[PDB]
Amino acid sequence: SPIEEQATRLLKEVPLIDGHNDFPYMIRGWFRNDINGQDAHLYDMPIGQTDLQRLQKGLLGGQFWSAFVPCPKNPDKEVGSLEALRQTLQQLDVIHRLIERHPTILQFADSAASIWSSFRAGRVASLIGIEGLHQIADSVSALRMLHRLGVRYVTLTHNCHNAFADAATVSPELHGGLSRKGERLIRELNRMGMMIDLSHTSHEAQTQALRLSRAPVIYSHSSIYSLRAHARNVTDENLHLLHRNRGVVMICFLRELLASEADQATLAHVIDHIIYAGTRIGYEHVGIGSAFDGMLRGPDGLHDVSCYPALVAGLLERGVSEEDVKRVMGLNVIRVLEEVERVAAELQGAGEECLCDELDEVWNEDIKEQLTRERERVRKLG
**Which chain residues interact with Fe ion by CB under 5 A?**
22, 66, 68, 131, 294
Q: State the minimum distance, in angstroms, from the CB of residue 247 to a copy of itself.
A: 28
Q: Binds 68, which of Fe ion, a copy of itself, none (CB < 5 to 8 A, cut-off by type)?
A: Fe ion
CA distance 11 to 6: 9
Q: Binds 92, which of Fe ion, a copy of itself, none (CB < 5 to 8 A, cut-off by type)?
A: a copy of itself
CB 209 within 8 A of CB 156: yes
Is the CB of 260 or the CB of 370 nearer to a copy of itself?
Answer: 370
Burial class (CB in 10 A: 0-12, 13-18, 19+), 350: exposed
Q: Binds 375, which of a copy of itself, Fe ion, none (CB < 5 to 8 A, cut-off by type)?
A: a copy of itself
Is the CB of 33 or the CB of 235 nearer to a copy of itself?
Answer: 33
Q: Binds 90, which of Fe ion, a copy of itself, none (CB < 5 to 8 A, cut-off by type)?
A: a copy of itself
Q: State the minimum distance, in angstroms, from the CB of residue 109 to a copy of itself.
A: 15
Q: State the minimum distance, in angstroms, from the CB of residue 12 to a copy of itself.
A: 25
Is the CB of 84 or the CB of 329 nearer to a copy of itself?
Answer: 84
Q: Binds 22, which of Fe ion, a copy of itself, none (CB < 5 to 8 A, cut-off by type)?
A: Fe ion
Nearest to 51 by CA among 213, 261, 293, 230: 293
Q: Binds 294, which of a copy of itself, Fe ion, none (CB < 5 to 8 A, cut-off by type)?
A: Fe ion
Q: State the minimum distance, in angstroms, from the CB of residue 305 to a copy of itself.
A: 11
Is the CB of 130 or the CB of 316 nearer to Fe ion?
Answer: 130
Q: State the minimum distance, in angstroms, from the CB of residue 208 to a copy of itself.
A: 26
The alpha carbon dihedral of 277, 280, 281, 285 has a sign of: positive
The secondary structure element, H or E, covering residue 324 is helix 322-326
CA distance 86 to 89: 5
Whole-angstrom CA distances from 366 to 358, 370, 375, 379 are: 22, 6, 14, 20
Q: Which residues of 45-82 are buried (b: 16+ CB within 10 A; e: fewer)?
A: beebbbbbebbbebbbbbbbbbbbbbbbeeeeeeebbb
Is the CB of 187 or the CB of 243 nearer to a copy of itself?
Answer: 187
Is the CB of 165 or the CB of 275 nearer to Fe ion?
Answer: 165
Burial class (CB in 10 A: 0-12, 13-18, 19+), 366: exposed
Is the CB of 66 or the CB of 207 nearer to Fe ion?
Answer: 66
Q: State the minimum distance, in angstroms, from the CB of residue 157 to Fe ion.
A: 10
Q: State the minimum distance, in angstroms, from the CB of residue 63 to Fe ion.
A: 13
CA angle 172, 243, 108 (to 5 degrees): 85
Give contact residues for a copy of itself (rule: CB under 8 A).
Answer: 28-30, 32-34, 36-37, 45-49, 70, 78-79, 82-83, 85-86, 89-90, 92-94, 96-97, 137, 139, 141-142, 144-145, 148-149, 296-297, 303-304, 353-354, 356-357, 359, 361-363, 367-368, 370-372, 374-375, 377-378, 381
Locate the DSSP E strands across the chain. 17-21, 62-66, 106-108, 124-131, 151-155, 195-197, 218-219, 248-251, 286-288
Neighbours of 301 (CB within 10 A): 16
Nearest to 199 by CA among 163, 230, 237: 230
Q: Binds 368, which of Fe ion, a copy of itself, none (CB < 5 to 8 A, cut-off by type)?
A: a copy of itself
Q: State the minimum distance, in angstroms, from the CB of residue 354 to Fe ion.
A: 26
Whole-angstrom CA distances from 240 to 278, 299, 339, 355 are: 12, 28, 19, 29
Q: State the minimum distance, in angstroms, from the CB of residue 347 to a copy of itself.
A: 14
CB 324 within 8 A of CB 14: no
Is the CB of 128 or the CB of 313 nearer to a copy of itself?
Answer: 128
Give strand pairing partners of 262. Answer: none
